[PDB]
Design a protein around this ligand. Sequence first.
Ligand SMILES: *CCC(=O)NCCCNc1nc(=O)c2ncn([C@@H]3O[C@H](COP(=O)(O)OP(=O)(O)OP(=O)(O)O)[C@@H](O)[C@H]3O)c2[nH]1
Ligand SMILES: [Mg+2]
Ligand SMILES: [Y+3]
Ligand SMILES: [Y+3]
Ligand SMILES: [Y+3]
Length: 176
Amino acid sequence: KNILKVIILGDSGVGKTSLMHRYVNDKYSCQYIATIGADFLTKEVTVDGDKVATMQVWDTAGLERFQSLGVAFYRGADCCVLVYDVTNASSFENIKSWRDEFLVHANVNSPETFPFVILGNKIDAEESKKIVSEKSAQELAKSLGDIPLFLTSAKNAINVDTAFEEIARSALQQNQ
Ligand SMILES: *CCC(=O)NCCCNc1nc(=O)c2ncn([C@@H]3O[C@H](COP(=O)(O)OP(=O)(O)OP(=O)(O)O)[C@@H](O)[C@H]3O)c2[nH]1
Ligand SMILES: [Mg+2]
Ligand SMILES: [Y+3]
Ligand SMILES: [Y+3]
Ligand SMILES: [Y+3]
């Protein structure tokens, strides 16, 4: 009865709640409502056709100072999703910070093999606003352990399911 805990980290505003809503419920709103608290949605998933699982996807506030649950957010995760916004250089520069935050709080026994997935969200944005290049993102993903990178739009439903299937796969791997 495979239950997979996935947590999503990243700065305030990058699209964490939007990517979860898109994946689970296919909903998206242009309006911004900052996440208060921590909670999860549920998605039934199968990996490789034959491996049935329930994925619990957890979402809380982006900035650490408004992360109400604290350490308990991180505990027992099978995969950590790290999200930046391609229109915000600071968010991208914080991806290593978030990876490090997780490894300390989740006290993982094999940091070099624990599953992270990087999502560069907001790929639909006006081109002149897009200030983080895919090349930089690929360079960071290599340098953090050859972790998978997906470029996504929660808004226009680009690559969100594909990303989450790799999150699911890699969480199953870890959980087993
Ligand atoms: C719909 C109006 C419109 O066309 N706007 C133009 C560009 C919109 N691009 C765009 N692309 C996406 O893929 C987006 N995902 C989310 N958002 C928007 O950004 C704001 C923040 O979203 P949240 O999911 O609330 O971010 P989160 O990380 O969850 O913040 P905290 O809780 O941590 O604070 C929202 O306005 C959302 O619509 C995209 N926008
Ligand atoms: Mg949110
Ligand atoms: Y869907
Ligand atoms: Y911290
Ligand atoms: Y080693």
